């Protein structure tokens, strides 16, 4: 004598994270800024070094 309610099916998908890759280790390698302007400010002048 039990009134059966209609079941509720979940129509929602799981959400993603802020880490854009799998690990936090693999993701850390892909945050190093690469370019030709980064080598520019490191080697700046040899005569200033000399």
């Amino acid at each position: 004598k039990e009134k059966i309610p209609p079941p509720a099916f979940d129509e929602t998908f799981k959400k993603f994270t802020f880490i854009k890759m799998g690990n936090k280790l693999i993701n850390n390698v892909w945050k190093i800024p690469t370019g030709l302007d980064k080598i520019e400010q490191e080697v700046k002048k040899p005569e200033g070094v000399y």
């Binding site: 080598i39 520019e40 080697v43 700046k44 002048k45 040899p46 005569e47």
Partner: protein, 80 residues
């Protein structure tokens, strides 16, 4: 042409960055001897194309020999 678009030019490998003159001519010696044996009107192009030499002092050196010493390989000095 693929060598030209990938490797940076000789003028700003000595001005923006600072590479050394043994290392700068080692990359750009096969190209500056293929173009000199291609056409003779290109002979006036490359030798005008020169940047500032901040590593060595050009004040009482002769550039008639300083450019001439760094341009030649062992291919055109020794013969057997």
């Amino acid at each position: 042409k693929a060598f030209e678009e990938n490797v940076l030019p000789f003028v700003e490998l000595n001005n923006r960055f600072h590479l050394s003159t043994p290392w700068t001519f080692h990359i750009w010696r096969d190209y500056l001897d293929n173009q000199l044996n291609s056409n003779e009107n290109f002979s006036i192009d490359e030798l005008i194309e020169g940047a500032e030499f901040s590593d060595v002092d050009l004040t009482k050196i002769s550039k008639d020999l300083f450019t001439t010493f760094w341009r030649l390989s062992l291919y055109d000095i020794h013969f057997d």
